[PDB]
Amino acid sequence: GSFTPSGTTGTTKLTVTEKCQVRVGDLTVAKTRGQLTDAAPIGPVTVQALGCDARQVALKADTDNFEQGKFFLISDNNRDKLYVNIRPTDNSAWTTDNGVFYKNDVGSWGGIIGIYVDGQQTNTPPGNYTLTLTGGYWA
Amino acid sequence: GSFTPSGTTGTTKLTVTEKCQVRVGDLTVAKTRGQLTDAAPIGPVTVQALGCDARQVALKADTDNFEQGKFFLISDNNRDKLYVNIRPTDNSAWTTDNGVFYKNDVGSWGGIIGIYVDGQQTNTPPGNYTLTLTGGYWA
Amino acid sequence: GSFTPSGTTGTTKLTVTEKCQVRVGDLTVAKTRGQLTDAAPIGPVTVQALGCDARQVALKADTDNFEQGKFFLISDNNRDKLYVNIRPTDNSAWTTDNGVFYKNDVGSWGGIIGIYVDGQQTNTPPGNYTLTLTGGYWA
Ligand SMILES: O=C(N[C@H](CO)[C@H](O)c1ccc([N+](=O)[O-])cc1)C(Cl)Cl
Ligand SMILES: O=C(N[C@H](CO)[C@H](O)c1ccc([N+](=O)[O-])cc1)C(Cl)Cl
Ligand SMILES: O=C(N[C@H](CO)[C@H](O)c1ccc([N+](=O)[O-])cc1)C(Cl)Cl
């Protein structure tokens, strides 16, 4: 029931815009609110564990990225939420516990964690959304 | 007369130094104050609009980057200014309005916005200067 | 006895973890506390000076990275220290002065500054450590 910080941090960034999309500078993940349909993919999160043969790999979201067992991207102003679902691409079993996404079994797991839109949210206010996940293990 | 945020943010970074220039870490845009001559190029800003056939493409500078219809890079301490001119590389017509640089015509414009030194400023105090521009449209 | 800021900033980043290491997102410099052995290499810092034929090249650490003529990486919370040694890879002579690492001779020096662990610190609390160095010259 406890998470131990032991790994690097991965950041999932997304810019939400209207139909008229103006991309400035280098290419980045951007979408129109209309694209925020249920199950819509946001981006992958690579995970590579080492020396965790006797520990349950886990990812913890920043305090501003979870609440009520629900995960979500947060606008730069910490006001707007973009509810998402976290799910590995393989058939591995994971559990959610107060902002923590841990693996049900021990082992140095390596894989991809996909971030998807949880419920159609085409009304999402334009802005920059972020989801931060830190590597570690669960007990 | 109103700007709508709808796009990504582009950041133009520049480090001003003295004759003795000590570059630490990875290569970045750096110049000596003596290089801050009138019309001196600072860097390009790519712009790619989509779904703006009926909107006027626009770029808005951060509050700390404009004043009195004048644009300028700002030191990390928000104290020193480096006045610059914003101009597309093509023959397109643009207008400046209270920190907003919008296109005079509608259409999903794609192009390069150049940043140049506005007036010789070889006295610019050494430091890190930044100019942030956000994509959107004008009404 | 005085440092003049005149160059870019280089940042040395390191994530300290336990045996069970969970790497999230893109690859970054990460190590287990057990790897924090004396003289253990942390990372190189490239230095390229120009127009310093009559000046002593120098690197200044951020206020939070030095104290008592000692350099060290600092956790994101500014609480935990990771004492390190700064040493060029060549045979050049350098001096340490209140957070400043300057060259004993003048000239536009180009080289690599290595960051090593100063004394075994395998008890270092897991976290993200940073060491910021700014380019300039000494008088
Ligand atoms: O973005 C995702 N999937 C896309 C579909 O748009 C695609 O299937 C994909 C799969 C793996 C991947 N990766 O491993 O880097 C990247 C994209 C999910 Cl991982 Cl969120
Ligand atoms: O830097 C600029 N121009 C330089 C001249 O030093 C050069 O002409 C250039 C043009 C285009 C460009 N781009 O499109 O990426 C980059 C450099 C202006 Cl775009 Cl600010
Ligand atoms: O990391 C270092 N040295 C490593 C040993 O692990 C290696 O010798 C090295 C040397 C030079 C270098 N470089 O110049 O980029 C990188 C690694 C020291 Cl420069 Cl801190």
Author numbering:
A (entry chain A), B (entry chain A), C (entry chain A): 0 to 138
Please share excerpts from the published article on this structure.
The major adhesin subunit (DraE/AfaE) of these organelles mediates attachment of the bacterium to the surface of the host cell and possibly intracellular invasion through its recognition of the complement regulator decay-accelerating factor (DAF) and/or members of the carcinoembryonic antigen (CEA) family. The adhesin subunit of the Dr haemagglutinin, a Dr-family member, additionally binds type IV collagen and is inhibited in all its receptor interactions by the antibiotic chloram­phenicol (CLM). In this study, previous structural work is built upon by reporting the X-ray structures of DraE bound to two chloramphenicol derivatives: chloramphenicol succinate (CLS) and bromamphenicol (BRM).
The aromatic ‘head’ group of THM comprises a para-substituted methyl phenyl sulfone moiety. Soaks of THM into CLS cocrystals were attempted based on the assumption that the tetrahedral methyl sulfone group of THM could be distinguished from the planar nitro group of CLS in the electron density. Therefore, we concluded that THM was unable to enter the CLM-binding pocket of DraE in the P3 crystal form. The two THM molecules in the ASU adopt a similar conformation to CLM in the physio­logical binding site and are positioned at the interface between two subunit copies. In more detail, hydrogen bonds are formed between the carbonyl of THM and the main-chain amide of Val105, the primary hydroxyl group OH(3) of THM forms hydrogen bonds to the side-chain atoms of Asp104 on one subunit (chains F and C) and Thr36 on the other (chains D and B), and a hydrogen bond occurs between the main-chain carbonyl of Gly33 and the amide within the aliphatic tail of THM.
